[PDB]
């Protein structure tokens, strides 16, 4: 007996391990809970990647020249090596501005004194003054524009709540701050916004009444959470992934069920209970496990249960004993008011078909169904067609068809109950068919289980008023709590159930009492804002993943694993343990990640990383784009920042083998045989590179010397072409100057000249709003209250429980 | 002759599933009440008072 | 070796191929291959392939390894079904899943 106990605990852990469920599935509540608004990032300087430099310049003969100049370089020149690192490190830069990427900005916060201003001029940020004063110091500056910095001034509009402050920025640097000040995602807050923001059902609830004691400035600011439904469809070919979600939602709905109050005595239901079946006088192999089970911490249990599991659309299972009768007609109300398809196919057959065999076909001395698993009828639906008795007919047609309605409300799917269990009305069907079968004759039953039967039928009868009470009371709290969803309730049978005892749906039914519960407009709230952290996370980290694999993909990431975006993004949902993840629903997943398309703000961004990657990476020092050798002797090109250099500015008249290519393929043939014969060529691709400024070193052709590793190692890693540097701070300078001789080299290095700095092109006025204040918690200004339990009432505008 | 090329072969399999040994540990069966288990001819067992 | 980092079966193929792609006599062709050598998923049918080297005789038991397995498709329908016919067509027992 223990043996299966063991194999059953085996199998199921086997198909557990498939499911990215936490173990202790009381913990997801904190994990759920836990999950936050977007944090609002603030942005407190601009974003910049360049700045002016003053960098020494040399005349056409290569003599220093008395005055440098300024010259854009990158405050942090970290490029890699290799074209593909090169990507990477753009890919790693789009992540960075997108962590960044401030929520709003207010450019007051960033501004400072322009020291060389005459009429207390302010400018932002820090790095604009630094600037501002170092040219306003230079002595090549033009005039006018010193004149133009003592003069150039912010504006400051308080009755506009508009800022104007002059800047110093780069032209990548200025569209990255400028996209963040044009698109900021902050939007005006007001009473209107807050009361549309509370569930339309909520506010029509004559038994909640919302007030808006709070006034909100026209600087109150909000950021709207991103509530699009479902684009991966996890309710469609994810079992692992729905199994997970309903599992966390019914363990988020359950805290948020209300506790009844005021149950009946469970010693006097027992005892009661006890004096009506006569269980002592039967035969009954299970003599004392008839009532047990039977408490208030039960009835507690299979309230939360099946409203949790109603909310969450999460599979139950049914846990019963069919030698327990009072199980099975306890069942009978449990099929009657919770919708036949939140129930596993086979427990429902099975829960059906103890009733039938066991109360209803033996009540009309019919033959016992012989039931074939598989059918498309179940039990009851047999039953049915096969009872002529009218009461427990239409009890069965009701249990046959009350499943879950479809309806769409505020954009949301909501699956809804029949207007009859609303009010509680199909409760005196149930009660019908329950009289009818106690006054059933049973033919061939013996009389003392037939009179337990039918006195077991009477129990759950004669609390017609209560059950009336309770199934009201269930679904006002079900509609209630589902108010507060804002994700499609997709139904699906998952891979795990939630078991659910009959003994505690005899609890419920035997021991509510008529106090009327009813979710505090706290707990509603509360379950609302944590509906909504869920979908807006999952929305921002959907939004995130496919930003990042489409960066990869159209940076040309190839070697890129879109599995640990995957996995990094259902982490962060924090619901799911990622180490049971099956690997065929991960494929699927990057899959549909990968269909879908890039936010607008990401995209935007991307576009600007994309097209300022070649005037970004052309900057850096530290790479070359690229090194042509050319087996002809060529004139040291004559440049500023250099002297003499073996410098081309274009790639035009050569062959072209692009080395990402030749280091991927393995194939040095052709690379070999151009080395060994002395053809021309062009090796393309981002390339570390030696300045040497030695004349003698021209002279040695070293700059030639530089590729046959290529040939030996069939690498291109350690390829470091020379970069000749030749001007009047060479040690042997005097070589150039006091011999008539042309400096050439065989070997040019392609790469670009740093962009000079103009003060027209750099100037900008950066505009945003003065002030405001950004709120998170809407809720928080509404005041919310409710009327007392006995006064509360249902949808039909009566009160909940009448039983008084 | 080794030939790599010639040598290369793409074997295709699932990519995951879960194989389980005994399918009776998913059922959990149980029995009506002795009283009243009936027999073949849809008569109880035992009948005697 | 692979450009797209991809993965082969078995660890004795990518022996093989680190061998072949490193030695210096190989000829640029076989590079190009190895570098193509990578894997593919087909995650809507529940499919993967992977490269592999082996002898033909040996490609032949593998690939009849691959192609006879012996599982078989496991629904709720299959386990209950397997119960004897005469159980589940006898009232007298009730039989459930969860």
């Given at each position: 007996?223990?043996?299966?106990?063991?194999?059953?605990?085996?199998?199921?852990?086997?198909?557990?391990?498939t499911?990215?469920?936490?173990?202790?599935?009381?913990?997801?509540l904190?994990?759920?809970?836990?999950?936050?608004?977007?944090?609002?990032?603030?942005?407190?300087?601009?974003?910049?990647?360049?700045?002016?430099?003053?960098?020494?310049?040399?005349?056409?003969?290569?003599?220093?020249?008395?005055?440098?100049?300024?010259?854009?370089?990158?405050?942090?020149?970290?490029?890699?090596?290799?074209?593909?690192?090169?990507?990477?490190?753009?890919?790693?830069?789009?992540?960075?501005?997108?962590?960044?990427?401030?929520?709003?900005?207010?450019?007051?916060?960033?501004a400072?004194?322009?020291?060389?201003s005459?009429?207390?001029?302010?400018?932002?940020?820090?790095?604009?003054?630094?600037?501002?004063?170092?040219?306003?110091?230079?002595?090549?500056?033009?005039?006018?524009?010193?004149?133009?910095?003592?003069?150039?001034?912010?504006?400051?509009?308080?009755?506009?709540?508009?800022?104007?402050?002059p800047?110093?920025?780069?032209?990548?640097?200025?569209?990255?701050?400028?996209?963040?000040?044009?698109?900021?995602?902050?939007?005006?807050?007001?009473?209107?916004?807050?009361?549309?923001?509370?569930?339309?059902?909520?506010?029509?609830?004559?038994?909640?009444?919302?007030?808006?004691?709070?006034?909100?400035?026209?600087t109150?600011?909000?950021?709207?959470?991103?509530?699009?439904?479902?684009?991966?469809?996890?309710?469609?070919?994810?079992?692992?992934?729905?199994?997970?979600?309903?599992?966390?939602?019914?363990?988020?709905?359950?805290?948020?069920?209300?506790?009844?109050?005021?149950?009946?005595?469970?010693?006097?239901?027992?005892?009661?209970?006890?004096?009506?079946?006569?269980?002592?006088?039967?035969?009954?192999?299970?003599?004392?496990?008839?009532?047990?089970?039977?408490?208030?911490?039960?009835?507690?249990?299979?309230?939360?249960?099946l409203?949790?599991?109603?909310?969450?659309?999460?599979?139950?299972?049914?846990?019963?004993?069919?030698?327990?009768?009072?199980?099975?007609?306890?069942?009978?109300?449990?099929?009657?008011?919770?919708?036949?398809?939140?129930?596993?196919?086979?427990?429902?057959?099975?829960?059906?078909?103890?009733?039938?065999?066991?109360?209803?076909?033996?009540?009309?001395?019919?033959?016992?169904?012989?039931?074939?698993?598989?059918?498309?009828?179940?039990?009851?639906?047999?039953?049915?067609?096969?009872?002529?008795?009218?009461?427990?007919a239409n009890?069965?047609?009701?249990?046959?068809?009350?499943?879950?309605?479809?309806?769409?409300i505020?954009?949301?799917?909501?699956?809804?109950?029949?207007?009859?269990?609303?009010?509680?009305?199909?409760?005196?069907?149930?009660?019908?068919?329950?009289?009818?079968?106690?006054?059933?004759?049973?033919?061939?039953?013996?009389?003392?289980?037939?009179?337990?039967?039918?006195?077991?039928?009477?129990?759950?009868?004669?609390?017609?008023?209560?059950?009336?009470?309770?199934?009201?009371?269930?679904?006002?709290n079900?509609?209630?709590?589902?108010?507060?969803?804002?994700?499609?309730?997709?139904?699906?049978?998952?891979?795990?159930?939630?078991?659910?005892?009959?003994?505690?749906?005899?609890?419920?039914?035997?021991?509510?009492?008529?106090?009327?519960?009813?979710?505090?407009?706290?707990?509603?709230?509360?379950?609302?804002?944590?509906?909504?952290?869920?979908?807006?996370?999952?929305?921002?980290?959907?939004?995130?993943?496919?930003?990042?694999i489409?960066?990869?993909?159209?940076?040309?990431l190839?070697?890129?694993?879109?599995?640990?975006?995957?996995?990094?993004?259902?982490k962060?949902?924090?619901?799911?343990?990622?180490?049971?993840?099956?690997?065929?629903?991960?494929?699927?997943?990057?899959?549909?990640?990968?269909?879908?398309?890039?936010?607008?703000?990401?995209?935007?961004?991307?576009?600007?990383?994309?097209?300022?990657?070649?005037?970004?990476?052309?900057?850096?020092?530290?790479?070359?784009?690229?090194?042509?050798?050319?087996?002809?002797?060529?004139?040291?090109?004559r440049?500023?920042?250099?002297?003499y250099?073996?410098?081309?500015?274009?790639?035009?008249?050569?062959?072209?083998?692009?080395?990402?290519?030749?280091?991927?393929?393995?194939?040095?043939?052709?690379?070999?045989?151009?080395?060994?014969?002395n053809?021309?060529?062009?090796?393309?691709?981002?390339?570390?590179?030696?300045?040497?400024?030695?004349?003698?070193?021209?002279?040695?052709?070293?700059?030639?010397?530089?590729?046959?590793?290529?040939?030996?190692?069939?690498?291109?890693?350690?390829?470091?072409?020379?970069?000749?540097?030749?001007?009047?701070?060479?040690?042997?300078?005097?070589?150039?100057?006091?011999?008539?001789?042309?400096?050439?080299?065989?070997?040019?290095?392609?790469?670009?000249?740093?962009?000079?700095?103009?003060?027209?092109?750099?100037?900008?006025?950066?505009?945003?709003?003065?002030?405001?204040?950004?709120?998170?918690?809407?809720?928080?200004?509404?005041?919310?209250?409710?009327?007392?339990?006995?006064?509360?009432?249902?949808?039909?505008?009566?009160?909940?429980?009448?039983?008084?």
């Amino acid at each position: 007996k223990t043996k299966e106990e063991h194999q059953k605990e085996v199998q199921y852990e086997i198909l557990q391990k498939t499911i990215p469920t936490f173990e202790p599935k009381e913990s997801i509540l904190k994990k759920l809970e836990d999950i936050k608004p977007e944090q609002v990032k603030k942005q407190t300087k601009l974003f910049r990647i360049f700045e002016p430099r003053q960098l020494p310049v040399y005349r056409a003969n290569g003599e220093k020249e008395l005055r440098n100049r300024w010259y854009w370089k990158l405050k942090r020149d970290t490029l890699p090596d290799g074209d593909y690192d090169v990507r990477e490190y753009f890919l790693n830069l789009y992540d960075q501005v997108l962590t960044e990427m401030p929520d709003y900005l207010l450019l007051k916060d960033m501004a400072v004194e322009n020291k060389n201003s005459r009429d207390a001029g302010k400018v932002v940020d820090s790095e604009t003054a630094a600037i501002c004063d170092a040219i306003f110091q230079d002595e090549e500056t033009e005039g006018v524009v010193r004149r133009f910095i003592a003069e150039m001034r912010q504006r400051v509009q308080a009755d506009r709540n508009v800022v104007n402050y002059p800047s110093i920025l780069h032209p990548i640097d200025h569209a990255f701050n400028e996209y963040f000040l044009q698109h900021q995602l902050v939007e005006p807050l007001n009473n209107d916004i807050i009361f549309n923001y509370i569930p339309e059902r909520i506010r029509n609830d004559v038994n909640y009444i919302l007030n808006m004691d709070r006034n909100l400035p026209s600087t109150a600011r909000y950021i709207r959470p991103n509530l699009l439904q479902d684009r991966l469809n996890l309710h469609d070919n994810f079992e692992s992934l729905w199994d997970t979600i309903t599992t966390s939602n019914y363990i988020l709905a359950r805290s948020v069920v209300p506790d009844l109050k005021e149950l009946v005595s469970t010693e006097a239901q027992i005892q009661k209970m006890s004096q009506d079946l006569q269980l002592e006088a039967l035969t009954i192999q299970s003599e004392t496990q008839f009532l047990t089970g039977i408490n208030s911490q039960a009835a507690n249990d299979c309230f939360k249960t099946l409203i949790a599991a109603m909310l969450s659309q999460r599979t139950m299972s049914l846990d019963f004993v069919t030698t327990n009768y009072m199980s099975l007609i306890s069942g009978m109300w449990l099929l009657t008011v919770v919708p036949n398809d939140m129930f596993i196919r086979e427990s429902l057959v099975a829960c059906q078909l103890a009733i039938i065999n066991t109360i209803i076909y033996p009540a009309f001395g019919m033959q016992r169904m012989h039931y074939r698993n598989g059918d498309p009828q179940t039990p009851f639906q047999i039953a049915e067609q096969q009872i002529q008795n009218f009461q427990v007919a239409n009890w069965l047609h009701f249990v046959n068809n009350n499943q879950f309605r479809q309806v769409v409300i505020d954009g949301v799917l909501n699956q809804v109950l029949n207007d009859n269990i609303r009010n509680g009305h199909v409760v005196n069907q149930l009660m019908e068919a329950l009289m009818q079968l106690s006054r059933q004759q049973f033919p061939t039953m013996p009389v003392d289980y037939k009179r337990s039967i039918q006195r077991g039928i009477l129990l759950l009868s004669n609390r017609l008023g209560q059950l009336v009470d309770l199934t009201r009371l269930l679904a006002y709290n079900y509609e209630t709590l589902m108010a507060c969803i804002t994700m499609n309730m997709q139904h699906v049978q998952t891979l795990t159930t939630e078991k659910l005892q009959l003994t505690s749906v005899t609890s419920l039914c035997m021991l509510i009492g008529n106090a009327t519960v009813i979710p505090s407009p706290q707990t509603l709230f509360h379950y609302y804002n944590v509906n909504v952290n869920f979908h807006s996370n999952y929305n921002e980290r959907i939004n995130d993943a496919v930003a990042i694999i489409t960066a990869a993909n159209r940076l040309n990431l190839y070697q890129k694993k879109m599995k640990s975006i995957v996995e990094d993004f259902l982490k962060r949902l924090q619901i799911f343990d990622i180490s049971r993840v099956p690997d065929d629903q991960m494929y699927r997943l990057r899959d549909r990640l990968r269909l879908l398309p890039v936010e607008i703000r990401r995209l935007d961004i991307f576009n600007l990383i994309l097209m300022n990657m070649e005037q970004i990476e052309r900057a850096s020092d530290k790479i070359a784009q690229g090194v042509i050798i050319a087996y002809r002797d060529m004139q040291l090109e004559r440049d500023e920042m250099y002297g003499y250099v073996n410098i081309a500015r274009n790639l035009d008249g050569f062959q072209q083998i692009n080395l990402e290519e030749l280091m991927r393929t393995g194939d040095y043939a052709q690379i070999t045989n151009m080395l060994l014969n002395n053809q021309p060529v062009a090796l393309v691709g981002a390339l570390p590179f030696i300045t040497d400024s030695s004349v003698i070193s021209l002279v040695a052709k070293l700059d030639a010397t530089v590729f046959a590793q290529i040939v030996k190692l069939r690498k291109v890693d350690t390829l470091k072409p020379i970069l000749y540097k030749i001007n009047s701070d060479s040690n042997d300078f005097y070589l150039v100057a006091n011999y008539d001789w042309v400096p050439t080299s065989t070997t040019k290095v392609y790469k670009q000249i740093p962009q000079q700095f103009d003060f027209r092109a750099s100037m900008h006025m950066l505009t945003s709003n003065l002030t405001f204040t950004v709120y998170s918690d809407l809720l928080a200004f509404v005041s919310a209250d409710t009327v007392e339990p006995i006064n509360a009432v249902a949808f039909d505008n009566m009160r909940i429980m009448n039983e008084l």
